[PDB]
Amino acid sequence: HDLARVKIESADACLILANKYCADPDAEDASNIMRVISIKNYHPKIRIITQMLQYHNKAHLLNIPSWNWKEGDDAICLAELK
Amino acid sequence: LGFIAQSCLAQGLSTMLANLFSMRSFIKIEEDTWQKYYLEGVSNEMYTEYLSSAFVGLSFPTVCELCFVKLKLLMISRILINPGNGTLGFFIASDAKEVKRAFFYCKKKYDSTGMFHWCAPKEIEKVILTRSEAAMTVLSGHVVVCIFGDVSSALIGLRNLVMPLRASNFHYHELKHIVFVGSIEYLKREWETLHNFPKVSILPGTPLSRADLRAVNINLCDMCVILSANQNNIDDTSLQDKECILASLNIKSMQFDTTGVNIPIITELVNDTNVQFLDQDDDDDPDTELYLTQPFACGTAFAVSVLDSLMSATYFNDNILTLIRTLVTGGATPELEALIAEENALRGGYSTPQTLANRDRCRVAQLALLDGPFADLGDGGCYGDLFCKALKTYNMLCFGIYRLRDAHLSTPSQCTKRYVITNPPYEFELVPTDLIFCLMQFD
Amino acid sequence: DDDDDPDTELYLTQPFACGTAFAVSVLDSLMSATYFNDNILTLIRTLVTGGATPELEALIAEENALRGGYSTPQTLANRDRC
């Protein structure tokens, strides 16, 4: 319902920020996978740009059927890029 | 775990039992969807009453059979499940007032007890499978169980999962091989109760890895069962069930040289709210109850919350409870409970004709309507005709119809999801592409 | 041997301008760029980390481990990258 409030359907993109300074990086990555799953579940077509604290979690989120990197989805892996 | 195993034998049976045990009124919505047929199915409930004088005459079964058309109800002193060849009758009708109509209207290879298969104790190293060894081995129509565990994870008790699968009325060739994929340490912790069982294999790794799931031949497995044992340590709503959702979504997305969505998978959820993430093509409303959801209606999701209703039903009819223990986990004779109390370890004994005779108990199975003598009845459009013909010919008692979601829609669709309908009326439309829940005797 | 000031931003600090210090903070700005140009992020993953092609991403997704194979003319052909 909150996604219906912010109009995800007409939104061109959705940006998920991450708390880089966290006690457990896997926990923050897991919160982000919840965010991504929820947003894709309400709407798979919408673009998602997200921060990734670990590289293998990027592999986990690649396993999502709704995730489609070719068209408009991006994953920014902080460890990989640094 | 018994409900999960029965769903493994016949997909969507856990939903059937859960809806039977929960008390639901009759609801009709005007707009044509699968939800009308599902809501008609869930309205029926489990009941018990004594048979009338008409049914206690020349013989019990013959008078009991085929009389369900006039009674408008279905029947399931000892516990009797689909009998063949003042006594209680277990009825699946809707409302207890109309259920009160039958009475008023008179017009060494096995285990010691013989209930389950048994074999010599085995070492954990004997059944450990590596990716190569699992890959070369031919696994088809088998059971794969993904287990999320750590050192601090509590004991799931997979023994109650493995007993219902290997019952005496199942031949050794008819058995389904069971492979547990997960951390080796946790599986070792629970292996001691498991080493007495046959056809069990262990694969260290994680279900998130696609390589392991390819090695265990998911595309041809009969059921994939996802469990997490760490739910008691984690308390936050978000932290719960993330591994299960990821495993289900990764299995769905996996592609084979076909799409993994058609793979049958059952996932255990501690939090009902997560159920919306299981199916991508589903409308999600938080207010919607768990039983109304598509993943539960199709039998792909199970949660223990529904079992709460049992506490009510068990009070009103004690017999009901034990019948459940007969429909799941195989048979639960008091001698078996006495042996568990004394030893806690299942033990096998030398076969005697008495044990071999104790195999007539029926078992749940799926019947395919496309191929078989009932093909003509499939397009006829009368469920009650199928019911009567099956009862007369094969004495097979059918609980209900496991039906494609989009069959009622005129335009053909590629969806494979099927929902259960319990005790459909006599005048119920029937399509060729349906499954029948049935109880079958030993052969 | 530098003038330190907590008010000074990291990009203006002497050790960062010398290329001897790094932090993930700067990488945050990537999100903004990644929204306005999708392809630019690809260029980043090409300029750093070498060349991670769709095929390599698929292989890592399937296996999570690098694999070596016998050379073929096609494999030796895609070496033109600067």
Ligand SMILES: [Ca+2]
């Ligand atoms: Ca009712």
Ligand SMILES: [Ca+2]
């Ligand atoms: Ca959904």
